[PDB]
Design a binder for this molecule. Structure first.
Ligand SMILES: Cn1c(Nc2c(Cl)ccc(CNC(=O)C(C)(C)C)c2Cl)nc2cc(C(=O)NCC(F)(F)F)c(OCC(C)(C)O)cc21
Ligand SMILES: Cn1c(Nc2c(Cl)ccc(CNC(=O)C(C)(C)C)c2Cl)nc2cc(C(=O)NCC(F)(F)F)c(OCC(C)(C)O)cc21
Ligand SMILES: Cn1c(Nc2c(Cl)ccc(CNC(=O)C(C)(C)C)c2Cl)nc2cc(C(=O)NCC(F)(F)F)c(OCC(C)(C)O)cc21
Ligand SMILES: N[C@@H](CCC(=O)N[C@@H](CS)C(=O)NCC(=O)O)C(=O)O
Ligand SMILES: N[C@@H](CCC(=O)N[C@@H](CS)C(=O)NCC(=O)O)C(=O)O
Ligand SMILES: N[C@@H](CCC(=O)N[C@@H](CS)C(=O)NCC(=O)O)C(=O)O
Lengths: 162, 162, 162
């Protein structure tokens, strides 16, 4: 599986990107003094700092969207890697998703004008959709009747008693 | 692993179901004009459309619940597939989860009367619980003392010097 | 892969811990009468019980944080298990993460003083960071030029025509 080290490379960089979003979220909490729990708020000034902030909420939205997209990629991309796809095609799938998700986070936390973020979401979802369809294709043909699968390989049953 | 193509089939259909929930979420945002970000709201009418909506929140809750349930299934079901279970039993696990989760989303976005949704949640969780216990069983017996594992296979140590 | 049954053991216990958080969340909803959906609220007293509660929100935050941390562990830990690491070192990674995450949930739902929870988060993230770096290391060296990889193995090219 020559696509596997490519997948492990892109997938792990994405998980690390998610860890970075988490770190950013914490730092925004500190600087804005907006904590989710009263116990946190006491340690950093007092009870009034148990409150929401637009930037914290934005960070949480970016993190959630990552979870809604990157996690299924971790699954789909892994399985797809064992379907023996064209190595260059596989790279393209992984790279489009990686560039797209990084761009998504930049457009989100950077508050770029609409619909830039929405576009990056859709573009990144394209290779995921492709991998899902390809996996479904391979799983489905497993359950095709043996006679049909034989015919698709140019083999019809023989009436010759041999 | 004859259960594997069954698993890949159900698991991928579930990921696609999650993508559909995402799409529905976006469409509800458009129609209700309820955006999470001010930049989105400007592009689609103005700042007043940066607001929440009960349907958007409902969609987000359905998506989160999917994430809380389908993602561990992707993990448990995969590992379970390599434990060589009875193929029919494996199918049943995958199918109960698939039917249950689809039903869960229908009951959620369709606002059916309580406790229909809650019931579908519990029913779908049953095969997950079963797979988790079975995996734990197999992992645990790996760490059993060699003498005990031998005895469970009908082999006691021999005092005969051979 | 001697680390694998160790991983499957810790990982599955963590998924079960997440299921328990879900169960706790439901019970807190019942006792506090704080439901997210109006249909649920009707079944359990009436429309006024469609409301938020600090404990429910806290439970949801704990569950989300689990999702932000345990899910990438399920991925990283699995891949790491096939990198043939030292069995004792692998155990340590899995055990630090398991103890840390359990401690995180206890500190969260138990409302312990800050920064206890935040500390357990960081400690648990340490083995994840280590596994991610190690995976990246192995993936990266796959794409090193063949000549460099040979040299790192003590093999320079030979000018002798043999
Ligand atoms: C006051 N405090 C906080 N406060 C806090 C609270 Cl109460 C709530 C929310 C945040 C924001 N979180 C963040 O910024 C993260 C880096 C944890 C993601 C923070 Cl930073 N987090 C800490 C985190 C740590 C921490 O993780 N230290 C490193 C260790 F865990 F390995 F010990 C810490 O250790 C200091 C010392 C002396 C114990 O080493 C202190 C900490
Ligand atoms: C105005 N707009 C939006 N608006 C928007 C905003 Cl600002 C915020 C929230 C939503 C709701 N999201 C959705 O409905 C999704 C389908 C993206 C899930 C939407 Cl639809 N999303 C777009 C998304 C796209 C889009 O993804 N186009 C296809 C492409 F990405 F491949 F180019 C787009 O492309 C139009 C054009 C001319 C650039 O092709 C325009 C778009
Ligand atoms: C009234 N009710 C609710 N209410 C409810 C509602 Cl409407 C909203 C939120 C919660 C909190 N959820 C929880 O506590 C969970 C255990 C589901 C996580 C609950 Cl408990 N959930 C049920 C859940 C079930 C349930 O899951 N029963 C077991 C079965 F599904 F296998 F049938 C149920 O079955 C009773 C009967 C007679 C149908 O067996 C009734 C239920
Ligand atoms: N949970 C998403 C579902 C649709 C989606 O993923 N939309 C993309 C493109 S508009 C996005 O960036 N959503 C922002 C978000 O999830 O906060 C939402 O509420 O919008
Ligand atoms: N996060 C869940 C934990 C319990 C759970 O999963 N409940 C099921 C059956 S009541 C459900 O459908 N919850 C709706 C949801 O998560 O919005 C919650 O807040 O209720
Ligand atoms: N989503 C997290 C990102 C940072 C994080 O994971 N922080 C740890 C240590 S402070 C935590 O326990 N956060 C609580 C939470 O996610 O509710 C947040 O909003 O704080």
């Amino acid at each position: 599986s020559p696509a596997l080290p490519a997948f492990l490379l892109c997938s792990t960089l994405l998980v690390i990107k998610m860890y970075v979003v988490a770190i950013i979220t914490g730092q925004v909490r500190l600087r804005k003094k907006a904590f989710a729990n009263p116990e946190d708020a006491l340690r950093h000034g007092g009870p009034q700092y148990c409150r929401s902030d637009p930037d914290v909420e934005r960070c949480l939205r970016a993190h959630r969207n990552d979870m809604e997209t990157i996690y299924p990629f971790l699954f789909l991309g892994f399985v797809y890697s064992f379907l023996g796809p064209n190595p260059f095609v596989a790279w393209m799938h992984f790279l489009v998703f990686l560039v797209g998700r990084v761009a998504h986070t930049v457009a989100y936390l950077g508050k770029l004008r609409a619909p830039i973020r929405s576009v990056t979401y859709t573009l990144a979802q394209l290779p995921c959709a492709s991998m899902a369809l390809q996996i479904l294709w391979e799983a489905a043909r497993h359950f095709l009747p043996a006679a049909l699968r034989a015919a698709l390989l140019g083999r019809l049953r023989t009436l010759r008693p041999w």
